[PDB]
Design a protein around this nucleic acid. Structure first.
Lengths: 114, 94, 135, 118, 51, 21, 218
RNA sequence: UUUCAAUGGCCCGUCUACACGGACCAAGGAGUCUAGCAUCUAUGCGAGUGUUUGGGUGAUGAAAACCCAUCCGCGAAAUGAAAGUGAAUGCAGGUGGGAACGCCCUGGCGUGCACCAUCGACCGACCCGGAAGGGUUUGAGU
RNA sequence: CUGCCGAAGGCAGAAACUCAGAUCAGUUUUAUGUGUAAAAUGAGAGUUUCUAGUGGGCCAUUUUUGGUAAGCAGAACUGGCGAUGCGGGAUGAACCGAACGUGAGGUUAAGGUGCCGGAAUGUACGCUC
RNA sequence: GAAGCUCAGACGAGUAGGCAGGCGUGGAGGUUUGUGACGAAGCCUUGGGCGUGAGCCUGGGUCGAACAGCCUCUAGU
């Protein structure tokens, strides 16, 4: 239905990306920005977000969210760690700036992996 | 569910139904209310409380001034002239 | 008490909304709604559409366009044969009451639409259904 | 910040050092007049809520990283954004092939492993 | 705010904050200078050194 | 009742008398 | 923004010399009060007459017995006085009604008239205000002005004056003040702690000797 | 981890100090299911509510699920020993408090839920009268 | 397993709503004779409703009568015990302190400072073989 | 993880009794591209780690074919 009802059914407990333990839970979502359970970070439970994986970047928007096949758009970066920082932050300036730092840091850790 | 009981934490601790005239118009279907209530017709609607499962009609409520015929076995004392002052007549069914 | 006993997701959302409204406004009405949202069904009796119509058109009346608010169920009363132009915002409407309201008269609203129209409670009569009625 | 443990000796059940039918796991004494329950002198201490450790350091290993159980490479990848606060611990039933595959994945992740050399 | 209670009586800065008068207090003042007037009634001396 | 105020106790009229138990 | 900051700083400054002038006035009043008592005694001695000082309106009460084996009457009285522990101290408006009340808890408390240093020492070091039913230390004059601003008390010196001189708002000033939680006296008590102070013990009235105890308490 | 040194430490359970059980170990071992009733909570519907006594469909396992139908159960009306009778006068009655709201210009003003104090009428059973009218009797009544 | 509340010799808790009060107090003053009435101090005070366990006894206290070689017996109140660990009295169900989360530092209570035993074979004045 | 974050103060015996949150066992539905003959479960251990605790993970040895986390359900727990 909506973002919040999806959260309260999915985000809180029921999700194929939840890993609960002694006192903590983590996120396996290929769409999440922080790896943690939050309203700010769950793209299933909220509108358009962006995320990076190994580097290809997922992006979303609302008007075609009813079509899963073309819902997630992918842009590919294979130039430089520093360069990738400019494309990531440039394409998130006009987008909610809360998770720019988390996305940038994911770029840095994952380039360190490479 | 046994798991949420108290012992799982005590472990280690040792024949005549009646209707009032306020509900008489409820017995008639929605169509009858729409096509007889609130207007002036030479033919008057008839209410058969017997077919609805009521033996006696009692006298709690008011009525709209629309005349109506009430078919019943027993009728209440001043509920009769409640119909008559409303313009209807109680025709007793056997 | 600080949370409802129900697991209903939509009741939780309404609790979430009016928790913010109560704590960020000066509306004692909002505090009352939050308290009545936490009350249980035995403390949330249903109010009849006949009672709502009587209360609006009571004595001096002055019902006008004042929105009627009850934290509960607006049950229908078949005993009256006409329904006035009414506007009631409530937790839940029975299908009979909702149809009778909409077909002949005004409108029904959820507590969401109440927060959209009169978030502070201005021009809202806060009715409650009859308690006891023990059987 | 450093790590402080309020207590290191674990609480043994009373008389577990006298009987073998009595396990070492803690059981709260129930007798009304028992010395342990009435807390006399020179008696083994009872688990109290006051014995808990600092929240900022609770569950943390001596090196400060909380141990996170890992069975496959996916679980290794989940510690990518938490390598500074969590350490992957290999499940005891993971075979040798997945163990070497996982341990090099963690070494490439820069994630500490508490049972790597096994 | 106020993570630690500082005693004004041992910390000069805190005393300065709470009491904007300690800058000019002048505790030790000269009242006696030298001209002291010995004053005790002879009746008082007699009743004191009585019995 | 408030505490007794400071006042005067003239003794020239009644000089103190020595009392012994 | 600059105008508001300047307006804030100015009014806060004007409050500061106001506090300074009040504190200077109270200090001068204390010295003039002690000078007049000395002059009154000296002239009486010179004339052969006698002079009776004012009996002080302020009393400091310290509870010296634990919460065990206390009769319910004494328990209720000390509950009224807010002496719920040992070593707890309170300022009380000594009057006719307080005297007989203290005559019952005499074996359990010791009281005497505090001097200026004692009342100043206690409030600065052990002074904790009761704000929103919470125990908040008097670390700044903002707490005092926001909690007792309706009785013209704006600083610690103002509170000390209202307590030491027993002002019109003494009840409000004392009730704002959490009971003093004093330590065990350095050097200790006497040989027996639960006799009367007059009998070589420690309980009961001790007049001007409460200051010596309080110095050890602090 | 073992051990030593100093300090402390009476053998656990049961029963009103005693007494009764206890050589040791492993496994088993004691508030369960069900019928009714009551409080509370939650869910669905709401002057209604309840499919599974029954019938139809169910092919992929068919003891499930889904659908359909009249009785009938409880409730919608109470009182009387019983025949029986069998409820808004007066916005479905008023007064005061009363949540919330509105109006100004803290307070006042309205405004009044629920509920509580009052309060009149009505339904009856009781009495008088021959339906009207009169009681200051009554019912977990409108 | 842990945490919180916690008795009883009509209670403790839960829910439903009053008034920001002069509304109560194991209390003391004032007035009238332990009763009543109308200043101090403390506290947010409350009302209807239902629902677990208990209704025992030991010890001492002050008020009396019956008493005797001699104790003793019967009342009322008060507390402690009982649900209570800790310091001291050599040790102890009722004696003196003190009401208990895990620790660091300081200071004491009761009792102590010849040795066992942490602490003055300290100071001062007398008594005693 | 609005079921969250944050600041402050007070408090801490506990039987009868009341309330709340968790650990562990057998089986069922969902999920984990879940673990496993390159060794599952079990067992032993003067190894290591976590939790106040119920308990949990892990190194070494033995061993041979199944087993577990998460959310619900259930009980001869």
């Amino acid at each position: 239905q909506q973002d919040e009802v999806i959260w309260q059914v999915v985000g809180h407990e029921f999700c194929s990306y939840r890993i609960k333990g002694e006192a903590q839970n983590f996120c396996r979502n290929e769409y999440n920005v922080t790896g943690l359970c939050n309203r700010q970070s769950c793209p299933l439970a909220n509108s358009r977000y962006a995320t990076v994986r190994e580097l290809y970047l997922y992006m979303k928007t609302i008007e075609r969210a009813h079509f899963p096949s073309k819902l997630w758009q992918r842009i590919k970066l294979s130039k430089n760690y520093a360069k990738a920082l400019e494309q990531i932050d440039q394409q998130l300036l006009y987008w909610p700036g809360r998770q720019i730092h988390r996305c940038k840091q994911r770029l840095t850790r994952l380039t360190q992996y490479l | 569910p046994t798991h949420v009981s108290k012992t799982r934490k005590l472990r280690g601790h040792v024949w005549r139904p009646t209707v009032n005239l306020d509900r008489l118009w409820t017995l008639l279907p929605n169509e009858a209310r729409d096509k007889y209530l609130g207007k002036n017709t030479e033919v008057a609607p008839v209410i058969n409380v017997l077919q609805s499962g009521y033996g006696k009609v009692l006298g709690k409520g008011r009525l709209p001034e629309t005349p109506v015929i009430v078919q019943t076995r027993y009728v209440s004392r001043r509920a009769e002239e409640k119909i008559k002052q409303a313009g209807g007549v109680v025709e007793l069914i056997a | 008490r600080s949370k409802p006993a129900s697991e209903n997701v939509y009741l939780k959302l309404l609790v979430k909304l009016y928790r913010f409204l109560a704590r960020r406004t000066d509306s004692r009405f909002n505090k009352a709604i939050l308290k009545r949202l936490f009350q249980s069904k035995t403390n949330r009796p249903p109010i009849s559409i006949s009672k709502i119509a009587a209360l609006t058109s009571r004595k001096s009346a002055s019902s006008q366009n004042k929105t009627t608010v009850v934290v509960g169920t607006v049950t229908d009363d078949e005993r009256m044969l006409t329904v006035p132009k009414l506007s009631i915002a409530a937790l839940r409407f029975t299908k009979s009451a909702r149809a009778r309201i909409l077909k002949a008269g005004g409108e029904v609203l959820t507590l969401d639409q109440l927060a959209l129209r009169a978030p502070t409670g201005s021009n809202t009569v806060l009715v409650r259904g009859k308690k006891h009625a023990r059987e | 910040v450093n790590i402080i443990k309020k207590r290191t000796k674990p609480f043994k059940r009373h008389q577990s050092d006298r009987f073998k039918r009595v396990g070492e796991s803690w059981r709260k004494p129930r007798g009304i007049d028992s010395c342990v329950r009435r807390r006399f002198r020179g008696t083994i201490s009872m688990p109290k809520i006051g014995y808990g450790n600092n929240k900022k350091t609770r569950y943390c290993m001596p090196n400060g990283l909380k141990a996170f159980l890992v069975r496959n490479v996916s679980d290794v990848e989940l510690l990518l954004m938490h390598n500074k606060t969590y350490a992957a611990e290999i499940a005891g039933n993971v075979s040798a092939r997945k163990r070497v595959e996982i341990v090099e994945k963690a070494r490439a992740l820069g994630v500490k492993v508490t049972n790597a050399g096994a | 705010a106020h993570v630690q209670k500082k005693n004004p009586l041992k910390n000069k800065a805190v005393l300065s904050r709470l009491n904007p008068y300690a800058k000019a207090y002048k505790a030790n003042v000269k009242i006696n200078s030298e001209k002291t007037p010995k004053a005790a009634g002879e009746k008082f001396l007699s009743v004191l050194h009585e019995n | 009742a408030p505490p007794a105020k400071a006042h005067f106790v003239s003794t020239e009229n009644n000089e103190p008398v020595t009392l012994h138990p | 923004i600059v105008a508001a900051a300047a307006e804030k700083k100015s009014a806060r400054q004007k409050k500061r010399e106001l506090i300074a002038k009040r504190a200077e006035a109270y200090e001068a009043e204390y010295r003039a009060a002690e000078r007049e008592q000395i002059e009154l005694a000296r002239k009486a001695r010179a004339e052969g007459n006698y002079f009776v000082p004012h009996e002080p309106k302020l009393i400091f009460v310290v509870r010296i017995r634990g919460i065990n084996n206390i009769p319910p009457k004494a328990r209720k009285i000390m509950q009224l006085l807010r002496l719920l522990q040992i070593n707890n101290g309170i300022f009380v408006k000594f009057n006719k009604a307080i005297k007989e009340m203290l005559q019952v808890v005499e074996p359990y408390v010791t009281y005497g008239i505090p001097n200026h240093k004692t009342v100043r020492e206690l409030i600065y070091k052990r002074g904790f205000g009761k704000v929103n039913k919470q125990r908040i230390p008097l670390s700044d004059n903002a707490i005092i002005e926001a909690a007792l601003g309706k009785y013209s008390i704006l600083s610690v010196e103002d509170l000390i004056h209202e307590i030491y001189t027993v002002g019109p708002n003494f009840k409000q000033a004392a009730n704002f003040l959490w009971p003093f939680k004093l330590s065990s006296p350095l050097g200790g008590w006497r040989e027996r702690k639960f006799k009367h102070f007059i009998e070589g013990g420690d309980a009961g009235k001790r007049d001007e000797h409460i200051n010596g105890l309080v110095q050890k308490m602090l």
